Amino acid sequence: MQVWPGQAYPLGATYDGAGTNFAVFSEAAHRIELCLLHDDGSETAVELRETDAFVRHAYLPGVMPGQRYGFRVHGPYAPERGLRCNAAKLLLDPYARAVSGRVRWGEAVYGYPFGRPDARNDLDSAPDTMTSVVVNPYFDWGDDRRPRTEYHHTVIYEAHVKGLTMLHPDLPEELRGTYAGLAHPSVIGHLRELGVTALELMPVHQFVNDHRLVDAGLSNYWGYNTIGFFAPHNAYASWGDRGQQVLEFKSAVRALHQAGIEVILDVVYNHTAEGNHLGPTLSMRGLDNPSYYRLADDPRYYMDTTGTGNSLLMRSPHVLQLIMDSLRYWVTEMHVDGFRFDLAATLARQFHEVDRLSSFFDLVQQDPVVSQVKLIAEPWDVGEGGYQVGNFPPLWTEWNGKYRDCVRDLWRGEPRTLAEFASRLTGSSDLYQDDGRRPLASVNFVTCHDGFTLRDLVSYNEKRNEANGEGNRDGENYNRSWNCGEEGETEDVGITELRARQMRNFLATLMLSQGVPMLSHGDEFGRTQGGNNNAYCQDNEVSWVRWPKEAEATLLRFTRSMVRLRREHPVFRRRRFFHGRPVEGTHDELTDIAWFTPEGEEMTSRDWQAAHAQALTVFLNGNAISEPGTQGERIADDSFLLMFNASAKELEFVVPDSRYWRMVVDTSDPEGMPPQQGPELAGGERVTLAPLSLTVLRRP
Amino acid sequence: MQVWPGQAYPLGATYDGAGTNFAVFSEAAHRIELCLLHDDGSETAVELRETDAFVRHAYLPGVMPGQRYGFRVHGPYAPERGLRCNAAKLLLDPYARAVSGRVRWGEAVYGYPFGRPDARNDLDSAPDTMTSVVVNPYFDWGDDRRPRTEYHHTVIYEAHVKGLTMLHPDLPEELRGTYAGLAHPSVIGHLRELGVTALELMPVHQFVNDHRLVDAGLSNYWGYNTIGFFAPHNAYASWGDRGQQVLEFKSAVRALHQAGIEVILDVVYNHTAEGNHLGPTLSMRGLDNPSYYRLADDPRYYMDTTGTGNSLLMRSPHVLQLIMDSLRYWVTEMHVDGFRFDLAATLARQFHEVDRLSSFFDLVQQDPVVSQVKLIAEPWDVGEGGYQVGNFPPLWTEWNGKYRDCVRDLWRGEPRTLAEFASRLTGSSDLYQDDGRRPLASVNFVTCHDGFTLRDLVSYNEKRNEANGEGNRDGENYNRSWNCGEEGETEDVGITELRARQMRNFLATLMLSQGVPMLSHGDEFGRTQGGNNNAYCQDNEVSWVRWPKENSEAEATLLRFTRSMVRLRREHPVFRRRRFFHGRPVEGTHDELTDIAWFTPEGEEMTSRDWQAAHAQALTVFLNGNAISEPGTQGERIADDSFLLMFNASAKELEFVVPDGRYWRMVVDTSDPEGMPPQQGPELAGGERVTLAPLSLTVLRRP
């Protein structure tokens, strides 16, 4: 009942101690109403009249947080002109700092009558839809020391916010599956014992349960399909949904930085949950359709290049703004350490149909907030020629798809070249050069959420995604996976211990390779998705995490004692990866590395093209480490000796240099042998090595 | 020494409490040395070897602010390829946040042998160049009440740092013409008394006195030839040049802001002081010539659209970073509240012939520091289509040149269309909207450092820039002015009062015209340059401000006239409408209730054909003080007394009639020689005639 004009910046819900400033963009709306929602379901419509930059805005004192607010836009309803505004639907603030409730699917949330897509729907959208919230922006990050952990000291961990803690019998069933159950000391401590420096969560941006999904008993579980990029997802909030979740995720980040674990929340900006036409009408299509979504040359239909349904307009400057304003809000206000752009390949494509691609990596590389955080993405190829960009921000990294496809295609049985294999342990120096013209790292992974899990990775040759309901045609088809003898679990102990060390190999490869190793959550305990490699709608025992009570425990203390080895020996984590100098080393008795035959000699000019690159002996030196440290200190370390047997028949290797070596790891024995103490070796002496197995020696 | 790795961000020299972290962008250098200079000219070479994204960087612990550094770059000298590197010229860090010294012009700083322009010079440019200096960024902004005065309240004052406080008999000799002298209670007194709400600083980024001037008896007094966009110009500091100039500036904005006065600084971006080839190799030519300047068609030579030499390759990835990092270092480290873009017209012609132009007005649009501050610049006509940008930063303003050329043409006696002058008072609705598709303001000005001064505008018909040594072919050719009887200083009293009464017309028109006003340093006293209208090279008595003594009768009257026109504006809203006349018409609905209404000398409402008056000499604008349909800071109806503007640009007496039964109290008359805004006023009847001397104004007031 008291309306001041207020300010045009910042857009959204911003509370000035005893007032609130509301701002909403639209360049094609007629009139905007801000409907202050009451608990009894009544609308207190305040027309917003001050116009600046096509943003209507007004300030209401005495309107304190928890206040539920929406928008109503009267605009032209012409699907011929891309004008799909509607006054009946109560729109959502794209800068909603928090959102209450869930989508209750009905006729009302659709904005066209089910019979006619070009007709106008005039149902009230108000009770069924969600509801944006005025977030109290105060928070006490007490000693919030920003963990500036380096890339060459990082161990990422891909974990889901609900699927992680739903079954830990240590957390109250109150906090099970929730953001606070993330910052529980026992869980914050399970990573500390692993030795991970980077927690990369899945989308915490608030997402919508697909209509055609919940009406199938399922629910979007991963949720790369969002509506509001300024709010924690509310079904992960055990502290309620009336703005309290923002104090949740914030209380969970500070506790992570307490134990010095970074947060890397996942980010989708390649489509919106409103989907193509015939979808719902919730936030964007209603406020201003033709300058949030890229429309075809028939304004009635949205160009989905993938299956998503719609794509944002990456040339309309107000859309560029929601992205940089979205990224900045988390880094600064929720104190997040890096991002990862889902379908950054579909993302980086979209720009290049508006010339605006290489002008965006300029925006990234100039801004001080977003540049100096980790940006993790995936390689692409656009138009004709490739990336077609000049300057990659010098933290911008890719998930190495040609390393896992190279590792998976090693213990499987098929060949990768010894050249393909040399450059992969090396840290993919051939695809990611540190120049400042290419991504500067490789996020090595043997597995992630897409495709199998490490357990399923050696247990199936075809998927078993009939549980997704998509006719089994979905999901990665050629997982490059070998099942070790039979499909499904079988009792046969002969093969059941075969797999148990196949994962002891998949994990060891990841840790000794140069670069950034990433673990998917559950591959320490041996997590199984029932052969399902795309579990996006399995919000159940499929992608829950079973917590152990020996087999599942041997691998946990395998991983946890392996990660010790990575953190402890600097030849496996070289600040400048082998970007400069060759993979063989300039052959002499000083090089950082030199490759050997199981027979004993060095590889040679026409030896590097070994199609059956099954066996290898890689010697890394502990004194050729040509990098200064934190303070100009020469980082030094022992020399190590790797011996790979990606070949069934037992192989006999020979340790060169005549020097007392110590076997520090052996895949083949069942008790797990990072921790189990080992014997000394002489060097030169013939050793036998089990099939499909690794061994590593140590000497200063 | 002792060499640690360091980082690559932030570019430039940054003091760490115990160290200094250097970084320099050069994507074509082959190896970069850092040179720590002592006082006894000793260069300690430290080979920066770490290379992330073509930034060579190292961390030097124990290096302290005040320690002099520079860069030396080993790259190929092939101008047929465009590379003009030379290991022998002690470069400067483009990010250096305080610079010491001065160009000591000789053969050594130019980077080529004075016989051939295409060959290679090997002269040590270390004792003849400036030297970058590490700076301590700590400062105590106790309560920096950033005076975020809105555009309708803004009274902008264009001063020059030296040219404001050089001849003041209140400042000690120490602080005359400096930054700390800018912080004096005296000048801040005269800035408040006048009522300025934002002081505009002529170029403050360190600039290079052109060799063409230093071997000419002259020097670059303005400073539109800059080198390091991050440093206070050293020659303005009375405390020291090894870094300390940052500590003046901050304590200076500090003292200004406490008074409620913004700081809008002028920035020189269209060109760099190394200029075109045959120019001194100072900062960027040697580091990386390709990715700073706009070379084209032939590598050796620089696309010259700027007309002042080198342009700056607006698509280069680290040229966008240098500009944006330089804009906001002044807003969030020096606490500046706004900017002014010299030669924004040309800069937009450099930004668009790379097709990065639109990409920039989006880059300013999102950025929270550069967007939300006052952005002042020039109109332009780019390539094909004029503006050719979509949506402006909705704080973007222009220097309303079609205002001054329209009011100069008026009190000189030329027939600017009765519509061309309607919209100019009105808030310049026609050229400046508020959607976001055009600049959301109409910054007005009668005169400035470009062109005449206000006592010169009324005394000379042609420029007199002979003292510039450019043969008087430089300067605005027709300044649309008139000398008022005898060109120069006359003894004729009939002339001498005509001027100081024309000057009252020019100042008063300005202070009632909608939009955002602006004055230049000297007009409150009426400073004369001697008809010199481009005094860029007069660092002498020509453009210092003379301060009026106490027994200086006439000059003190203009000052007391000016100090109360700002009063009349800061005290009555009707002369500054939050949304200027931007939706409404320049006439209003011709009925009982309109914010505005235009009448005749003879006393009738002007007709639509009467809106086509070539000889548009006489006028009477009514503003309704109750028809202000704009909300308050809290939603109040802002209501006022009604005003009555009467103009006569004629040359004989014209009798006006007061259009409005009720009564009017005359509050401003220009023909009065005592000065009316600081005087009393008779009562006009409400229909009675008034005799109005030629070239004179009258404002009446009534609640």
Author numbering:
A (entry chain E): 1 to 549, 553 to 661, 664 to 705
B (entry chain A): 1 to 660, 663 to 705
Reported in the publication:
We first obtained a crystal structure of the apo GlgX enzyme to 3.5 Å resolution (Methods section). The structure was refined to Rwork/Rfree values of 21.1%/27.6% and consists of three main domains, an N-terminal β-sandwich region (residues 1–145) comprised of eight β-strands and several short helices, a Central domain (residues 146–575) that harbors a α/β barrel fold similar to that found in many α-amylase enzyme structures and which consists of eight β-strands surrounded by eight α-helices. Finally, the C-terminal domain (residues 576–706) contains three β-sheets assembled from eight β-strands. Strikingly, in the structure, a c-di-GMP monomer is bound at each end of an antiparallel GlgX dimer. Note, a similar dimer was observed in the crystal packing of the apo GlgX. Insight into this question was provided by an overlay of the c-di-GMP bound S. venezuelae GlgX onto the apo structure. This overlay revealed that significant conformational changes occur upon c-di-GMP binding in several regions of the structure that are transmitted to the active site region. Specifically, c-di-GMP binding leads to a restructuring of two loops formed by residues 432–442 and 579–593 within the C-domain region bound by the second messenger. This results in concomitant conformational changes in residues 377–396 and residues 341–355. Importantly, residues 377–396 and 341–355 contain the key catalytic residues, Glu378 and Asp342. Hence, the conformational changes lead to a restructuring of the active site pocket.
